[PDB]
Amino acid sequence: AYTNSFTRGVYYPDKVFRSSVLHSTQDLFLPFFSNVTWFH
Amino acid sequence: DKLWILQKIYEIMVRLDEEGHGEASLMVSDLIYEFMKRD
Amino acid sequence: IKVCEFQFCNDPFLGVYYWMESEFRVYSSANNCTFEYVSQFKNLREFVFKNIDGYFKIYSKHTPINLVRDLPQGFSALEPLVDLPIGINITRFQTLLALHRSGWTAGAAAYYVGYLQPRTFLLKYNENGTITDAVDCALDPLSETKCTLKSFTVEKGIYQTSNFRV
Amino acid sequence: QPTESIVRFPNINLCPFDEVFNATRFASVYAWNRKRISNCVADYSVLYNFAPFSAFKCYGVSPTKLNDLCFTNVYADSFVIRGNEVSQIAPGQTGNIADYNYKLPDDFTGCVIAWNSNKLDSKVGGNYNYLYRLFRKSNLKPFERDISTEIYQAGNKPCNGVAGFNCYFPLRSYGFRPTYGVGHQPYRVVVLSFELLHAPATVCGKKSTNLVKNKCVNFNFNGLTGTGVLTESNKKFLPF
Numbered sequence: 001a002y003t004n005s006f007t008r009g010v011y012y013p014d015k016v017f018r019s020s021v022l023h024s025t026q027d028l029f030l031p032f033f034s035n036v037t038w039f040h
Numbered sequence: 041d042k043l044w045i046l047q048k049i050y051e052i053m054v055r056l057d058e059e060g061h062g063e064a065s066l067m068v069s070d071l072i073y074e075f076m077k078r079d
Numbered sequence: 080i081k082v083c084e085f086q087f088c089n090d091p092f093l094g095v096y097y098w099m100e101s102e103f104r105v106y107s108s109a110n111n112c113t114f115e116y117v118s119q120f121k122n123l124r125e126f127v128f129k130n131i132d133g134y135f136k137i138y139s140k141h142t143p144i145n146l147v148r149d150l151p152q153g154f155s156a157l158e159p160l161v162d163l164p165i166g167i168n169i170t171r172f173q174t175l176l177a178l179h180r181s182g183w184t185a186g187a188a189a190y191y192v193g194y195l196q197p198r199t200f201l202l203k204y205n206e207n208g209t210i211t212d213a214v215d216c217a218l219d220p221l222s223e224t225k226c227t228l229k230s231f232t233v234e235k236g237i238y239q240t241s242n243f244r245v
Numbered sequence: 246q247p248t249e250s251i252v253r254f255p256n257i258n259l260c261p262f263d264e265v266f267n268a269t270r271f272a273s274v275y276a277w278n279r280k281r282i283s284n285c286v287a288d289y290s291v292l293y294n295f296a297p298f299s300a301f302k303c304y305g306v307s308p309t310k311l312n313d314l315c316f317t318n319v320y321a322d323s324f325v326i327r328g329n330e331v332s333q334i335a336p337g338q339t340g341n342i343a344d345y346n347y348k349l350p351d352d353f354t355g356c357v358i359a360w361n362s363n364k365l366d367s368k369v370g371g372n373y374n375y376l377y378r379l380f381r382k383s384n385l386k387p388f389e390r391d392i393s394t395e396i397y398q399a400g401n402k403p404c405n406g407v408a409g410f411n412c413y414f415p416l417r418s419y420g421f422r423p424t425y426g427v428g429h430q431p432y433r434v435v436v437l438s439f440e441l442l443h444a445p446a447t448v449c450g451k452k453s454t455n456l457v458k459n460k461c462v463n464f465n466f467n468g469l470t471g472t473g474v475l476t477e478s479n480k481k482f483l484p485f
């Protein structure tokens with residue numbers, strides 16, 4: 001069926017190092033709390 | 041004509057090689073190339 | 080990892096016999112082989128596969144988990160594990176499972192697939208540079224406010240985030 | 246102003262040129278060998294410093310420029326011909342080799358490299374393993390390979406697959422012997438083709454400069470060009 005993504009699916013957008021800062025990036029990300037298809 | 045002599049030059053290329061004149065054979069090889077290129 | 084011409088089997092897999100992998104029912108063709116790479120539940124393995132500008136990238140993360148089923152609720156940054164210059168169209172994919180030979184019965188496991196979408200994310204990089212939290216700018220109006228303020232905490236008040244149009 | 250420029254590039258894998266240039270047996274020119282080179286780093290000065298090369302000419306590139314460039318693929322074509330024929334391996338050439346065996350395009354991008362292989366490829370009594378094509382109806386196109394073995398028809402009568410009057414087997418052996426003059430001795434040839442498509446360039450020559458610290462310099466780190474002073478840091482960068 002399907003499951004909730006929650007906050008998973010976040011990856012570093014690039015090889016850039018940022019410390020103690022909030023960065024806004026537009027990229028191919030998994031939407032939060034989206035339906036993820038699960039298989040067993 | 042052109043064909044008689046072509047055959048004769050081919051034959052001498054081959055006979056040159058068979059009698060151990062490899063280098064000379066190669067030089068006739070080159071003549072065959074140039075001669076067949078002409079009109 | 081091989082970027083090469085393969086004719087996949089109808090049900091490709093690796094068959095394990097009691098445990099050692101004894102069968103390789105994956106492909107019948109290994110031709111025009113452009114690229115070959117040999118590289119190095121209590122375990123959660125997360126992989127992001129993105130094929131962009133001809134480069135295919137795998138982002139991998141390991142998480143110690145104790146949930147019986149489904150995605151545990153948590154935050155984990157997905158470090159880029161491998162990036163390769165592939166340059167071929169990728170429209171479909173298929174995971175290969177280790178279907179043990181009993182007639183094939185597989186051991187208990189779960190795999191989850193999610194399709195990435197173009198989204199704006201506000202990532203909180205800590206002192207180490209690790210992403211410790213993220214905000215999906217389109218998830219909800221509170222998240223839109225957090226993205227607009229460029230802050231994970233918004234002060235009391237009214238904020239203009241976007242424009243509604245029909 | 247920056248005192249001096251420093252360029253930093255990863256340590257610098259390897260391309261298997263040794264296997265091309267130091268192969269035991271080479272191909273006959275009519276059936277020339279092609280090796281695709283990709284996904285690797287090449288030191289081309291290892292090439293241009295190997296001392297016994299009788300020919301070494303590049304056409305749309307330069308040897309020292311090579312060790313700084315990246316390409317999508319490099320193709321290494323290789324064969325044996327006579328010394329006097331080496332000059333036909335060049336754009337715009339005609340002759341028995343260029344016409345009927347191995348043909349470069351007018352717009353060639355790469356290097357032609359040759360050396361004398363008399364010690365390896367000549368035999369007392371003649372080495373008949375190396376062949377060329379003497380007869381063909383028309384010229385090869387660039388990078389065409391013709392390995393057919395059909396009786397060539399020089400005259401008016403069809404050959405019907407039998408050699409005879411004006412019906413010639415189309416290939417000859419060189420029969421290289423060590424007593425031949427140098428023009429007739431065997432030369433090994435490597436043609437390098439440098440291909441740049443709209444794609445990642447994964448066959449890479451560049452340069453590495455000594456690092457300088459606490460000095461105003463113009464630095465180039467893997468394509469990141471900037472100016473400043475480089476000092477020790479306490480930031481724990483993640484490995485990626």
Ligand SMILES: *[C@@H]1O[C@H](CO)[C@@H](O)[C@H](O)[C@H]1NC(C)=O
Binds near residue numbers: 207
């Ligand atoms: C990395 O994280 C650890 C947490 O144990 C912390 O003690 C350390 O100061 C951090 N290092 C940097 C450079 O931010």
